[PDB]
């Protein structure tokens, strides 16, 4: 895959994307499907969204001990990103729903490695 030289040092907001196998400059098949208006908008709009997501992950990676509410993310966010609340609401969702955030603070519907879990299917 992508090879080269980076070194041994962390990264600001961008780093948030690194962890995720996806371009922090453009959108992916998923993001495009979830946010049609964004992908079908001006370079500006696209960036605005690509920034709201990355940022959301930052705050989450810093305080992943607690659930990241939509409000908090917005307040912390800086316009024009936060300006469009509708976006911050659609972005923060795609993440949580995709298990990209708030997945280690509350016990919500989710599978787990169990010793061959099984209630007792008869199917016969």
Tab-separated table of C-alpha atoms in Angstrom:
chain	number	residue	atom	x	y	z
A	1	UNK	CA	0.000	0.000	0.000
A	2	UNK	CA	1.012	3.603	0.639
A	3	UNK	CA	4.719	3.521	1.488
A	4	UNK	CA	7.241	6.244	2.270
A	5	UNK	CA	8.515	8.097	5.328
A	6	UNK	CA	6.540	9.691	8.161
A	7	UNK	CA	8.708	9.386	11.258
A	8	UNK	CA	7.717	9.079	14.910
A	9	UNK	CA	5.297	11.889	15.761
A	10	UNK	CA	1.533	12.321	16.303
A	11	UNK	CA	-0.820	14.506	14.264
A	12	UNK	CA	-3.528	17.067	14.961
A	13	UNK	CA	-6.994	16.734	13.447
A	14	UNK	CA	-5.661	14.994	10.340
A	15	UNK	CA	-4.428	12.132	12.501
A	16	UNK	CA	-8.064	11.404	13.311
A	17	UNK	CA	-8.493	10.316	9.692
A	18	UNK	CA	-5.259	8.320	9.542
A	19	UNK	CA	-6.605	5.700	11.949
A	20	UNK	CA	-9.368	5.269	9.372
A	21	UNK	CA	-8.452	3.855	5.962
A	22	UNK	CA	-9.862	6.779	3.979
A	23	UNK	CA	-8.830	10.069	2.319
A	24	UNK	CA	-9.043	13.052	4.671
A	25	UNK	CA	-9.131	15.342	1.635
A	26	UNK	CA	-11.963	13.722	-0.319
A	27	UNK	CA	-15.054	11.609	0.356
A	28	UNK	CA	-15.507	7.854	-0.052
A	29	UNK	CA	-18.214	5.702	-1.635
A	30	UNK	CA	-19.921	5.576	1.761
A	31	UNK	CA	-19.664	9.258	2.675
A	32	UNK	CA	-20.853	10.079	-0.843
A	33	UNK	CA	-23.893	7.829	-0.444
A	34	UNK	CA	-24.718	9.074	3.055
A	35	UNK	CA	-24.189	12.720	2.110
A	36	UNK	CA	-25.272	13.267	-1.519
A	37	UNK	CA	-25.558	17.049	-1.225
A	38	UNK	CA	-22.004	17.236	0.115
A	39	UNK	CA	-20.435	15.086	-2.601
A	40	UNK	CA	-22.528	16.968	-5.158
A	41	UNK	CA	-21.508	20.365	-3.820
A	42	UNK	CA	-18.747	22.985	-4.143
A	43	UNK	CA	-15.212	22.129	-3.030
A	44	UNK	CA	-16.039	24.312	-0.027
A	45	UNK	CA	-19.088	22.353	1.127
A	46	UNK	CA	-17.165	19.103	0.685
A	47	UNK	CA	-14.298	20.351	2.852
A	48	UNK	CA	-16.701	21.710	5.470
A	49	UNK	CA	-18.069	18.197	5.973
A	50	UNK	CA	-14.706	16.446	5.668
A	51	UNK	CA	-13.653	18.701	8.546
A	52	UNK	CA	-16.683	18.229	10.795
A	53	UNK	CA	-16.129	14.466	10.805
A	54	UNK	CA	-12.381	14.469	11.455
A	55	UNK	CA	-12.857	17.020	14.237
A	56	UNK	CA	-15.629	14.944	15.812
A	57	UNK	CA	-13.226	12.005	16.049
A	58	UNK	CA	-10.567	14.198	17.657
A	59	UNK	CA	-12.709	15.199	20.637
A	60	UNK	CA	-13.874	11.588	20.894
A	61	UNK	CA	-10.319	10.233	20.842
A	62	UNK	CA	-9.460	12.713	23.594
A	63	UNK	CA	-12.486	12.005	25.790
A	64	UNK	CA	-13.660	8.577	24.557
A	65	UNK	CA	-14.459	7.765	28.187
A	66	UNK	CA	-17.798	9.537	27.768
A	67	UNK	CA	-20.477	9.634	25.072
A	68	UNK	CA	-20.008	12.464	22.573
A	69	UNK	CA	-23.367	14.226	22.297
A	70	UNK	CA	-24.351	16.143	19.163
A	71	UNK	CA	-24.481	19.443	21.050
A	72	UNK	CA	-20.991	19.157	22.538
A	73	UNK	CA	-19.462	18.315	19.157
A	74	UNK	CA	-21.205	21.366	17.700
A	75	UNK	CA	-20.175	23.784	20.449
A	76	UNK	CA	-16.555	22.634	20.255
A	77	UNK	CA	-16.744	22.787	16.459
A	78	UNK	CA	-15.826	26.026	14.688
A	79	UNK	CA	-17.907	27.487	11.860
A	80	UNK	CA	-18.630	27.502	9.145
A	81	UNK	CA	-18.468	23.826	10.105
A	82	UNK	CA	-20.738	24.215	13.134
A	83	UNK	CA	-22.714	26.827	11.198
A	84	UNK	CA	-24.643	24.062	9.439
A	85	UNK	CA	-26.115	22.102	12.347
A	86	UNK	CA	-27.967	19.779	9.973
A	87	UNK	CA	-24.553	18.583	8.800
A	88	UNK	CA	-23.092	18.156	12.286
A	89	UNK	CA	-26.124	15.993	13.054
A	90	UNK	CA	-25.746	13.850	9.934
A	91	UNK	CA	-21.980	13.569	10.383
A	92	UNK	CA	-21.912	12.693	14.084
A	93	UNK	CA	-24.436	9.974	13.242
A	94	UNK	CA	-22.710	8.225	10.340
A	95	UNK	CA	-19.794	7.890	12.759
A	96	UNK	CA	-21.528	6.434	15.816
A	97	UNK	CA	-23.724	4.258	13.600
A	98	UNK	CA	-20.603	3.046	11.791
A	99	UNK	CA	-19.023	2.357	15.168
A	100	UNK	CA	-16.546	5.186	14.642
A	101	UNK	CA	-17.421	6.932	17.905
A	102	UNK	CA	-19.193	6.468	21.238
A	103	UNK	CA	-18.422	2.745	21.137
A	104	UNK	CA	-16.638	2.398	24.465
A	105	UNK	CA	-18.616	4.330	27.066
A	106	UNK	CA	-22.087	2.779	27.169
A	107	UNK	CA	-23.260	-0.812	26.733
A	108	UNK	CA	-25.342	-0.500	23.564
A	109	UNK	CA	-26.581	-3.186	21.173
A	110	UNK	CA	-23.365	-4.867	20.036
A	111	UNK	CA	-21.916	-8.384	19.612
A	112	UNK	CA	-18.984	-9.849	21.541
A	113	UNK	CA	-16.517	-12.775	21.537
A	114	UNK	CA	-18.398	-15.436	23.498
A	115	UNK	CA	-17.390	-19.059	24.066
A	116	UNK	CA	-19.460	-20.309	21.129
A	117	UNK	CA	-22.612	-18.576	22.365
A	118	UNK	CA	-25.816	-20.448	21.592
A	119	UNK	CA	-29.318	-20.534	23.059
A	120	UNK	CA	-30.283	-23.907	21.619
A	121	UNK	CA	-31.591	-24.057	18.033
A	122	UNK	CA	-33.718	-27.090	17.164
A	123	UNK	CA	-34.344	-26.588	13.446
A	124	UNK	CA	-35.716	-30.122	13.432
